[PDB]
């Protein structure tokens, strides 16, 4: 299982990522093998153990 | 030949993108600084921001023109599938039940077999009577009406 | 009362110059549709079973087609249309 | 790339029907490209596309 | 709707539009304010356009054989006819491939 | 929890005065977004010439309730009352209130001074009445639905005349008929026929199911039920079934019960505690 | 062992109103106290050009008709949200160790990102509303060319 | 094999040779019931005709 | 009394289980006691779920059980929060039932569904955090109505007829999902519910207005419509002025009939716990107002 | 590729559009085909009845 | 679909025709031509 919290917390590289189609269209139609989406502010990332 | 003529009317929908020209300072916009409104809950708080922009039209006559520039697809199938009036007028029945059943059997329209909240709601007001098609290769089924 | 120099493309036509702007850059990867991509409805109507007077009957095609001498050809009991894709489509 | 700007969600039945139609038409149009056409401008346009 | 020319045309811009939901496989009326309204020139014109139709496969086959704009002619036979497409629509759309 | 509402139409001085004079009335809005248009404000978005009064009750049950107290510039401020808090409310119905009572929300049956009209859109507010008055009004309207199907014989018209006028404390209301041009509107007919079929279907099914329950722990209740059923059959009569048919009858009875749930359970929205010659206004605790 | 070769973010493009060419059609004014208003009035002196006529043909007397335009309103709204943990680690900072400072800077950065995204959303909403009004004002090509 | 009366126009365009179209890019994804109804159930109409 | 409830585990926790707990924040879990401090054994529905004692028993136990939301969970400290009436809360749905705006929510034991997994999540050797279904009003009252109809029909019938009857009745589709009742069993609980239903139906047959028996038939003489065709078809299997009329008698009779109907009605109605006004576009969570 | 052999067209709605380009003698063997002619990978003419 | 005819007469007419004659699918009283979509045998396999 992937830990998206580590991805969100850690410093990230700023790339001008762009593609022909739409982000939500490619996400819904399963271009990406594994993905996690939330629709607001999510407190789960803040807690560390 | 039944002895009368039929003339059908159909609507086809296209997907288009348009080009519009506008005049220099054709209309003026008046805006304020954005105002925030708070709505606080237990797990998360949400902030609502609004800006009361309003427009004054400064044109004597029309100052902007739109053109239907380029079309590339037809959303409908441009088909000949006629409109099912038994869906449009579900409340109606023939006075004689044998005649009604035979006619609805010849037209290939399914009679409701049992009472449910859905059928009562549809008969009284309406609902999504006509289901989605099985495979829908040719786009949106066009409402081909007959007079 | 102050201006900022910014660069765009300009078309020249009819002794007036017009700014060209492609707003695709604004609406990328967002929920709301770009309003400049509009839908358009057109209504089509066609007859079936329409009888033709035979006292003023006429042909302008005899060199191109001929039909079997049958009653079915005499009365236009069906009509044919094209689909969204260019194939025939029979209505009766 | 031609249908890129319409879908912003998991494709509706109509949207993917249009996609299928475009798939079929564009497949039949260019199945053997250089054999059927040899215009410099057309082949240049195909390559740049 | 009978008003002054400017008033009737700006009303046609304002509200004289149709809306159909683009989700179902058939044309249901859209829920108010869901998505953009679809504009309809025929509503202002109050006319319906003709569509290429024929009462015999012979004339349809002839139109298919005629490779240069044959869809726009409305020739006819004894009790059999074709109704030409007054707008070059079928060949316009199919250009897109 | 506040909502702002903007008019597309053009306001004016006396228009704003008429708008503000309902300082603390209750307005129902379909769904609680932060910003809404004036078309959503009120019952005007639901009414038509074909529906009838019953639907407005059922749609009011699921429509969110909201209190209004301000007129800003081009927008109106709305507040959603919360459970357990007390608020200042206006008296808008034809009734006069008293301390300790419970309040119900009803579609308006009688009326001009409320009419804030802009482009033939009207600010039609609901009625705030005590629960006994709401029950009485709904029962009398439903009864008058029954008397409409005959409506020809003289005593039926006299009865309908008597139902139309209801007397409450210090007032009398001229309740209108639920039928126009001798036709009964569609939801009224639907609910009336559902109630009548519920009674009729229960009359048939009770014998079979009292027998089937009797093979279990037989008791006095089932004996009295059987005796009442024979009594009913004797009074009515002087005027092996397939499982799927039986299940169809049972499901039909239960769904016909469901369609009538809206009017039987009159819900409370407020409870009053203030006595006033200022009767225009009162303070209330919120329920919901 | 497993390998993680990088973490990537989208440096999404920013959009402004007065930097676009659409502002040329507009005439932008800022008015903070709009929320005090329930009317917008604009007065024009549209002087009429006219031609000297013949002997006694009926022609206009009048100059400077004074038609008045009213403002049309179109507020724009967008919400942004913050969670309880974000506020806890933002303001109630802990004098503890480095992990508490990590959470502090993460909350500060998420608030920064939310505010910047909301500002860009306001800009795009202004553009969208202005273009919607332009579309609803602009007649098609055929009518304007006819006129 | 094929019935004597099969429409000749069926052979003038690219069609499924089995007499019923199952271009399953049009059917809903992962809906086995819908796909099998489309392919086999003749109480519902075909597609592309 | 308590606005906070602290649940603690006897077992040592793995970081995978801690991650699952911190994911399950804002979900609904049931509690038997409404108390300050409880052990983890008496949390969830695994305590009560003996499938031999069917769905009716578990429904009766669950509707008496109290509900709470999940919170600041950490290593071996759960900290559940009991919602009070009227406030606005964020709640995460766990069942496959689609939530749409404006619907009222009800609590029911979980049903079966197509993917056949049942997902034995959070198994602490034996204990397993089985979590209830939060269902909108139409589907939940459909479960209750179908269970009551099941009990009313099934008595004095052979298993062969009942096989087809339950195979058609146990399966429910709601918003194009496919659910089926886990365990229909005729307990004394359902038997008493049927006793109440039979008494209510007898009373509505007895005291009902005399004209409401014949209003359907008068309308059938008046009208001919698909709705009325079906209405007549139901009554057909057993198939002018009134000499007197008095509004007071009708008023009293309909008041009594409404009392009887409301007695019969709430054998199917479930006391709503949440009313929704928000939806995430992935249906994974909604904001709701609590009802007590 | 797919192609039919031996189809019978409706006699009641029979028609021709090539009377000005080809003519055959009246014979039932011409009227009711039992053969289909085809090309090879070469331009040879092929038979299958 | 692939170019095939029910008689050698229409085959002779197709061989007489110019470029692009294979795509037309005309018919006779009981005889017919079915036309190919792609110009496979018109130019695609030979081109020289």
From Swiss-Prot, chain D:
Superkingdom in the source lineage: Viruses
Compartments where found: Virion; Host nucleus
Transmembrane segments: none
Family classification: Belongs to the herpesviridae major capsid protein family.
Subunit structure and binding partners: Homomultimer. Makes the hexons and eleven out of twelve pentons. Interacts with triplex proteins 1/TRX1 and 2/TRX2; adjacent capsomers are linked together in groups of three by triplexes, heterotrimeric complexes composed of one molecule of TRX1 and two molecules of TRX2. Interacts with scaffold protein; this interaction allows efficient MCP transport to the host nucleus. Interacts with capsid vertex component 2/CVC2. Interacts with the small capsomere-interacting protein/SCP.
Function comment: Self-assembles to form an icosahedral capsid with a T=16 symmetry, about 200 nm in diameter, and consisting of 150 hexons and 12 pentons (total of 162 capsomers). Hexons form the edges and faces of the capsid and are each composed of six MCP molecules. In contrast, one penton is found at each of the 12 vertices. Eleven of the pentons are MCP pentamers, while the last vertex is occupied by the portal complex.
Name of the protein described by the UniProt record: Major capsid protein
Originating species: Human cytomegalovirus (strain AD169) (HHV-5)
Gene: MCP
Covered residues, full protein: 197 to 245 of 1370
From Swiss-Prot, chain I:
Pfam families on file: Herpes_V23 (PF01802)
Keyword Acyltransferase attached: no
Primary location: virion
Compartments where located: Virion; Host nucleus
Transmembrane segment boundaries: none
Annotated keywords: Capsid protein, Host nucleus, Virion
Similarity comment text for this entry: Belongs to the herpesviridae TRX2 protein family.
Annotated function: Structural component of the T=16 icosahedral capsid. The capsid is composed of pentamers and hexamers of major capsid protein/MCP, which are linked together by heterotrimers called triplexes. These triplexes are formed by a single molecule of triplex protein 1/TRX1 and two copies of triplex protein 2/TRX2. Additionally, TRX1 is required for efficient transport of TRX2 to the nucleus, which is the site of capsid assembly.
Subunit and interaction comment: Interacts with TRX1 and major capisd protein/MCP.
Protein name: Triplex capsid protein 2
